[PDB]
Amino acid sequence: GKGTPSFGKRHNKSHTLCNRCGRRSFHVQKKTCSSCGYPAAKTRSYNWGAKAKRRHTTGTGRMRYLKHVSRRFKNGFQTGSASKASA
Amino acid sequence: AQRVTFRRRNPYNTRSNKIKVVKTPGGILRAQHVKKLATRPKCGDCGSALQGISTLRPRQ
Amino acid sequence: AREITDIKQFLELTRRADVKTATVKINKKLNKAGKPFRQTKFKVRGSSSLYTLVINDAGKAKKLIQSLPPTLKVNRL
Amino acid sequence: ANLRTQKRLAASVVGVGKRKVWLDPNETSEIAQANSRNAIRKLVKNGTIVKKAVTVHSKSRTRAHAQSKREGRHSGYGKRKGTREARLPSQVVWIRRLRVLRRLLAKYRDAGKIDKHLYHVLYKESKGNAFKHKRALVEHIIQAKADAQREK
Amino acid sequence: AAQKSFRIKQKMAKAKKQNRPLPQWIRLRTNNTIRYNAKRRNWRRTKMNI
RNA sequence: UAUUGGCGAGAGACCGAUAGCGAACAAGUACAGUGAUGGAAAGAUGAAAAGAACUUUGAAAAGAGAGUGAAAAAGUACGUG
RNA sequence: GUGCAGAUCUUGGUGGUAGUAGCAAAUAUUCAAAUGAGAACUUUGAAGACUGAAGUGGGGAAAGGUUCCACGUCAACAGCAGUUGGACGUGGGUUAGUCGAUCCUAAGAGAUGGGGAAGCUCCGUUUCAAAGGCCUGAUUUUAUGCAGGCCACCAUCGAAAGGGAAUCCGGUUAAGAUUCCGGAACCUGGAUAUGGAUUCUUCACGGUAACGUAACUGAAUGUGGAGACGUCGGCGCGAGCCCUGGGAGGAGUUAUCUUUUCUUCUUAACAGCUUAUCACCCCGGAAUUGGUUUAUCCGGAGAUGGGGUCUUAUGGCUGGAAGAGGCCAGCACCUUUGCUGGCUCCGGUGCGCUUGUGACGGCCCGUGAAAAUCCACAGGAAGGAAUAGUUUUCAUGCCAGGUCGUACUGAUAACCGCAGCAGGUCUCCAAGGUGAACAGCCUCUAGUUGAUAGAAUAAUGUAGAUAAGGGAAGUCGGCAAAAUAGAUCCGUAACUUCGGGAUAAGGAUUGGCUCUAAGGGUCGGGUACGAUCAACUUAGAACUGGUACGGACAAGGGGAAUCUG
């Protein structure tokens, strides 16, 4: 009575969606996310989880700001505008 | 022999979920939800219900 | 949802400046043993309640519709 | 054709189940165009969809049988399956009888047939026994009133 | 579920719009290699897991 | 002086789609698990769609023709096979 | 990074087996027409059945996520088929002041001040903390500085079943509705105007009293009540359902019978008047003790009695409201589809069923949550009219009530089981007969008729049975089956912890029909009875039959001991 008869009682979510990573890893009763975590500003990551950093690190997402930092540096952090030329 | 349903999304027979079956002017049975009954106010000394006071639910 | 029993209290109701409308409902009923008679219902609609005046004497009904104000949007039946 | 949704709509328009609507098997082209409920309400009106009246469940063999129980039949020993307390509890029999004996005693007392001292004796013997019924109480009252008049 | 939060109804609203095939003009594009929608979901073949 | 990260360059007696990173592709994707995590397969028509007008058989897929093409022994089940 | 036949090698592909095992639980399908190229399976009709109201019915919670609904459509999926579909393609659909969330707290979770710990973080939840804002004054620069007075509670999260402001009826859709539409209400917050009330005795009068009412000022602070509560038993009452009578409609049966069989006859929320057990008040002062419950408790700490007051669960009447809904009839018509009439009436009954409720009673070394919130009382701070004020807990008037969820399934096909799996999965409603029965068996409403089919009827299976004579000889062992069984009456042993054993053991009866007897309700007696109405319970008698009768269903085998708990 521990296999397919007991499997029909599984209708209560232990984990719901996380607000930091959208993962469905947020444990409801613990009030913490098992993948990133909602408590502790420190994103959950370990060195034994070598693949786990590869899915979540920088560059894996949009990089809405870091897209332009290497180009903004290359021009030496200009301010102003280009004025005019010919043609 | 006209069977009836609840009208709200509480399907359990709790204290807040009482039902009296009433006949509508459409000629059908329909359940209506009845609030929980008011107790009488009681005396501060003897504890007996004190007369001349209407028995309402407390916000009424 | 409230019956008015005083006919002169019904007449002061029609000039209460929220009663824009009314209606006169006629019901064919019997006078408690035999023959039919005409009962009429004078329903005025106030701003928060409907007042009803039942009139069994169909003669006294005739002296009441002339007593209604000329501005009331009387809906016969 | 496919008159499945005209079967479903007509059951809701008429007010019966789907087992009690009859679609005309000769007007299947006209029913197949009735895609709305205002069009179904037309097809009920000109007789294309009818109400298919209720299957009878007559109670006449009950009412004929129930008359014979009133006349006294079918109550022999081979027709009872429950215990005597199951068919009629002895507490209910006692409740019927003791409410009778209290009611005649209260009726006799305020009518002036018996007084208050004879009542209070008869109230506690009736709560006990030896008044099996209303007859056995009345012949006791008749005797005790006549004996107290004989004692007077 | 049948009485939901908005954060759950928002995620079905998105996954409803992703329940469609390719637009068929996509396959006519220059150097287009997309042959079919390879992320199509169905409710009785793979649950969303919320 | 160090530098398996970041950014920009140059290379090689390296691997050549079961190899090389897990991933040459909408790849940390689809999918699995309550979760931590696990995690694929999948490149090649042709120089060019010129991707088969039209006829016939068939309910239709399609067939037989006809056609395009250097080649359908290249027909979106496509290099060779 | 160099040669493969092996590593139960790795990955990918492929045979024999083999058109084989099989596609056999859940009673069951058949005829015709349509459609289509094609129909065992789609649709319509007819018939036969089933679930049998602890449903195969009507709704929901969790979960799913669009499966809901329409149109088109059949390559794959529906382990046969397919014109069908929970499939494929395209769209459509979820409307709220009142239903929930939101607010409150529960078990618990958890910051802050602090204190640990190298640290990730741990403890702790009012702590060894200088913990926070309430009603008005003072401004007539003018914005809110400052002046009296109090309050000290010391985060926050935690229930879509607990607590809780308030909405019902009718109609409408392809799919929505307590959400839309028509009518009719209520609540909260807010301004507010008029009337009523009060006032020259300033803050109402009446009643002996319980207390009454259209109102009838009351801050700080304090007290109290409601929220706020177990379980079982019987009784009373109500609601709905069931049963039944007359009448007004319709439908069925009609060889013969049947004043017959079936069916419609309904009244919401809200509001006004009235309505009760309990409780209380006045008069009176009781032994010859009285009242009274089904259940034995009450009375000089004031009974019985006479007269009253209240709670308004509940019911009756009226409004809502017949104009709605229902059942019919008569005319109309390629039409949107109409139009016009009636009737919608009065009862009866109960150990009935479900449910709510009241007064009680039993039980506990078990006495069966909290908080938000609301009201009252005490207090009398304070403001108050007479040439004119006070009041907005009385009546009417005016404005607004956000956000989010709302479709559908809820399971032998929408959830979880690798799946369209005989498994698992919380709950409400709940008809008739038999019968003690929510058992089994049959039917009404509602819903299905789904599960690969056709033909034969070998062996051996699986499920169900029956056997002459004997009766456990079978077997480790009466395993399996049979026998018994309901009710009524009789009769019951050893032993016992005196409660039991005990349905001990062991016997008899049981149908149908026709009668007999007993068990009741209400009405009028000035200060012995009779009319009438309505129950199913028990006992007995005659007759009757292929000795049958708990006639199907349902339903104990029993005893004498030993070991052991």
Side-chain angles (χ1 to χ4, degrees):
Chain A
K2 44 182 172 185
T4 84
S6 87
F7 282 0
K9 306 170 184 170
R10 306 191 323 124
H11 50 78
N12 308 80
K13 290 171 191 157
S14 277
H15 299 95
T16 192
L17 303 167
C18 184
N19 278 3
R20 196 200 275 167
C21 52
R23 190 55 167 77
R24 199 176 139 268
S25 276
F26 189 74
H27 199 281
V28 171
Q29 310 191 15
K30 289 183 183 181
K31 308 278 192 43
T32 177
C33 174
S34 42
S35 194
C36 61
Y38 195 55
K42 298 225 186 212
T43 295
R44 209 198 65 114
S45 60
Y46 299 95
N47 290 310
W48 49 260
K51 282 204 189 188
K53 274 162 161 144
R54 196 162 72 198
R55 314 188 190 103
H56 297 103
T57 34
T58 175
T60 53
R62 291 173 52 172
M63 284 191 305
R64 326 204 289 276
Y65 186 63
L66 274 196
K67 258 174 186 310
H68 313 303
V69 178
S70 79
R71 181 242 290 159
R72 278 205 308 128
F73 153 77
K74 183 247 287 183
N75 321 284
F77 301 98
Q78 311 159 329
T79 38
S81 89
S83 292
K84 284 304 291 184
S86 184
Chain B
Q2 203 144 340
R3 282 160 303 171
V4 82
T5 60
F6 279 141
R7 290 180 88 172
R8 299 158 183 176
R9 291 190 177 270
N10 182 21
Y12 310 106
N13 200 5
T14 48
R15 256 203 283 113
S16 74
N17 204 1
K18 203 175 92 164
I19 282 301
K20 162 195 168 175
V21 165
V22 70
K23 286 197 63 59
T24 68
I28 60 149
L29 287 189
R30 193 175 303 164
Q32 57 171 353
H33 288 261
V34 188
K35 297 154 180 312
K36 301 183 296 144
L37 285 204
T39 44
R40 314 205 36 203
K42 305 296 178 291
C43 171
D45 286 29
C46 72
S48 57
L50 74 168
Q51 71 190 141
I53 316 295
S54 314
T55 78
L56 304 167
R57 290 308 283 194
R59 215 180 163 182
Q60 291 321 292
Chain C
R2 162 172 282 131
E3 189 161 319
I4 287 280
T5 42
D6 183 307
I7 195 152
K8 284 316 291 294
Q9 274 279 8
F10 174 77
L11 288 181
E12 315 313 294
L13 275 179
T14 59
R15 293 177 307 274
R16 204 183 68 189
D18 62 64
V19 196
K20 315 291 146 162
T21 183
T23 174
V24 182
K25 177 59 173 65
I26 318 293
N27 327 311
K28 318 292 284 145
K29 289 184 255 210
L30 326 169
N31 45 10
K32 282 74 63 185
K35 50 157 302 301
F37 82 109
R38 169 173 169 177
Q39 201 219 54
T40 169
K41 278 186 166 168
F42 288 85
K43 318 181 200 192
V44 292
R45 178 69 179 96
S47 194
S48 88
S49 82
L50 182 84
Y51 306 91
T52 308
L53 175 77
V54 289
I55 287 296
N56 274 46
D57 284 349
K60 189 193 212 323
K62 177 263 304 171
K63 303 175 231 208
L64 190 66
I65 318 176
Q66 302 153 223
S67 288
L68 255 56
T71 81
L72 219 46
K73 250 58 179 173
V74 179
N75 182 49
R76 319 283 321 248
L77 272 171
Chain D
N2 197 347
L3 305 191
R4 186 183 302 142
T5 197
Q6 274 79 52
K7 181 66 70 75
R8 176 192 65 85
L9 275 190
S12 172
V13 154
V14 169
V16 286
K18 308 176 63 183
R19 68 220 290 278
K20 296 209 178 322
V21 289
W22 174 88
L23 268 47
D24 207 339
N26 318 126
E27 292 255 21
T28 84
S29 58
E30 190 67 8
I31 301 183
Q33 256 61 41
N35 70 319
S36 42
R37 291 162 91 103
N38 269 6
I40 286 282
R41 275 147 89 200
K42 191 212 181 148
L43 265 63
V44 188
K45 190 164 62 174
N46 56 351
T48 319
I49 290 160
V50 295
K51 206 208 290 192
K52 214 169 192 266
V54 168
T55 311
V56 309
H57 181 200
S58 175
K59 295 188 272 323
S60 68
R61 288 179 327 275
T62 311
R63 289 187 209 118
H65 174 88
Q67 182 78 3
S68 73
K69 284 186 177 180
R70 263 184 292 275
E71 188 65 28
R73 318 289 180 273
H74 318 290
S75 297
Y77 285 128
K79 273 299 192 161
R80 324 206 190 120
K81 287 197 94 182
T83 65
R84 188 161 46 237
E85 301 287 327
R87 307 165 60 88
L88 180 42
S90 63
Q91 181 175 11
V92 177
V93 171
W94 167 257
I95 279 171
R96 281 180 176 158
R97 202 252 309 275
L98 186 71
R99 276 172 175 161
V100 167
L101 303 181
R102 285 169 201 237
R103 186 160 49 239
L104 184 135
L105 275 180
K107 181 195 209 262
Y108 269 29
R109 186 259 307 275
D110 52 61
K113 312 204 62 180
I114 67 160
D115 67 273
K116 69 166 190 171
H117 305 272
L118 185 46
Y119 173 85
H120 198 92
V121 188
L122 290 168
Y123 192 92
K124 294 189 177 302
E125 311 207 340
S126 86
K127 191 191 144 53
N129 269 325
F131 303 140
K132 307 149 43 202
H133 33 69
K134 201 168 99 161
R135 178 180 91 221
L137 181 55
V138 161
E139 308 314 281
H140 190 266
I141 289 170
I142 280 181
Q143 177 54 273
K145 283 172 59 53
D147 206 350
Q149 262 297 334
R150 151 82 279 191
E151 191 279 338
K152 213 193 179 83
Chain E
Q3 206 149 34
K4 306 167 254 272
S5 63
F6 180 77
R7 203 187 301 271
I8 302 287
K9 199 188 153 177
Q10 198 177 34
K11 291 200 83 89
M12 311 170 228
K14 167 167 178 69
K16 186 207 162 170
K17 308 161 195 169
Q18 313 178 310
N19 208 78
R20 75 163 271 160
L22 282 198
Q24 275 292 86
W25 56 265
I26 293 284
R27 302 218 285 169
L28 269 73
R29 294 180 329 191
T30 298
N31 282 186
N32 165 263
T33 55
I34 300 172
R35 309 306 293 132
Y36 79 112
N37 184 32
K39 294 182 189 173
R40 189 86 180 279
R41 201 189 39 84
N42 193 246
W43 64 270
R44 55 199 304 150
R45 319 288 169 216
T46 286
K47 298 299 178 184
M48 291 204 295
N49 302 130
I50 292 186

